[PDB]
Amino acid sequence: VETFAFQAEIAQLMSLIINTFYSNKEIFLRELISNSSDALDKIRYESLTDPSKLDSGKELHINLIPNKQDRTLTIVDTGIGMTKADLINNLGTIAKSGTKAFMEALQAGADISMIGQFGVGFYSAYLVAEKVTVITKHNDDEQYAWESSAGGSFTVRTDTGEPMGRGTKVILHLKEDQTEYLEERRIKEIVKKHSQFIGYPITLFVEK
Ligand SMILES: COc1ccc(-c2c(-c3cc(Br)c(O)cc3O)noc2NC(C)=O)cc1
Numbered sequence: 789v790e791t792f793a794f795q796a797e798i799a800q801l802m803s804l805i806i807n808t809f810y811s812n813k814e815i816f817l818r819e820l821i822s823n824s825s826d827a828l829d830k831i832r833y834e835s836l837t838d839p840s841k842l843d844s845g846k847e848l849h850i851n852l853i854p855n856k857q858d859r860t861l862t863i864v865d866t867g868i869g870m871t872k873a874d875l876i877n878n879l880g881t882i883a884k885s886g887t888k889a890f891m892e893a894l895q896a897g898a899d900i901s902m903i904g905q906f907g908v909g910f911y912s913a914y915l916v917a918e919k920v921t922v923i924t925k926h927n928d929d930e931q932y933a934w935e936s937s938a939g940g941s942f943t944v945r946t947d948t949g950e951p952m953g954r955g956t957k958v959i960l961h962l963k964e965d966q967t968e969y970l971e972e973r974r975i976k977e978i979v980k981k982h983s984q985f986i987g988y989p990i991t992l993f994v995e996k
Contacts (some may be wrong), residue, residue: 789945794987795880799940801887805914806938812964815901816916817975818982819909820958821990824850827867828958828988836866838966844927844954850986852979853993854970859962862971865988866955869926873935875944883908895967914938916969919961925952970995 794802828848835841845866853862868878886907893902901911913920922934931952936942960969968974975992983990 789943790876791875791941791943793941794936795884797887798880801891801908801911802914802938804891804894805900805911810900810915812901813915815903815982816912816994817863817969817978819912820848821979821983821986822904823866823869824863824956825867825986825988827869828865829867831866831868831950831954833938841927844925848990849991851991851993852975854972856967856970856995859964859967859970861960863960863977864955864958865957865959868954869929869966870922870932870955871926871929872932872944874926875922875924875932879965893935894992896926896966905994909990913958913960916962916966917960918963921959921961923947923949923952923957923959925954927954960965 789965795801813822828850831841832848837901848866849862851862853864854860855862890903890906890908893906894900900912900915919935919937923931924934925931931949932944933947933948933949934942934944935986962969969978972992979992
């Protein structure tokens, strides 16, 4: 397990998200579904010139899986997946500029719900999750697990759990007072409100 420090600007963003009073927390789900859609768009596009890129799975879709016993909401997609370099350095490089723009927008009157316009919507997960685990698999690369409970650090390891084929699984370990996001009616409501036109099937699993 390797441990890394967030860039200071990203740590500052995470602290703002965790500490600012803001009731409209449900927007986290739109942001993660949007990221999944983006990753699905990319594998679809690349498959048009190299069909073998779908050897790791032809189905392009998103599953939402609540588990009340583990207190997790999991978002699974079969998108392009992230590489080790994506997780450790490269996406963070991009996030630095988006965070700067977002911060300046907030100071100037914008609200947290506009976060995705700056390319850093992932971090809205910390509105509802005490810990986020991201399991991801890109073609021709290994399966990795990224994880953070904020506080300025994250970890990355090669994942020895169930093989995914290709794509990304975001496991939200929900805060104790945010368990509404495990309820079927609540998730359905949020998907219909904010993610109704996503161009891939979204299957909301039910609990056993
Ligand atoms: C908004 O920035 C993004 C958006 C998506 C990704 C991504 C992902 C990805 C990342 C997150 Br977090 C997520 O919730 C879902 C995803 O499928 N998998 O490959 C990618 N790789 C690419 C290039 O999309 C990475 C950065």
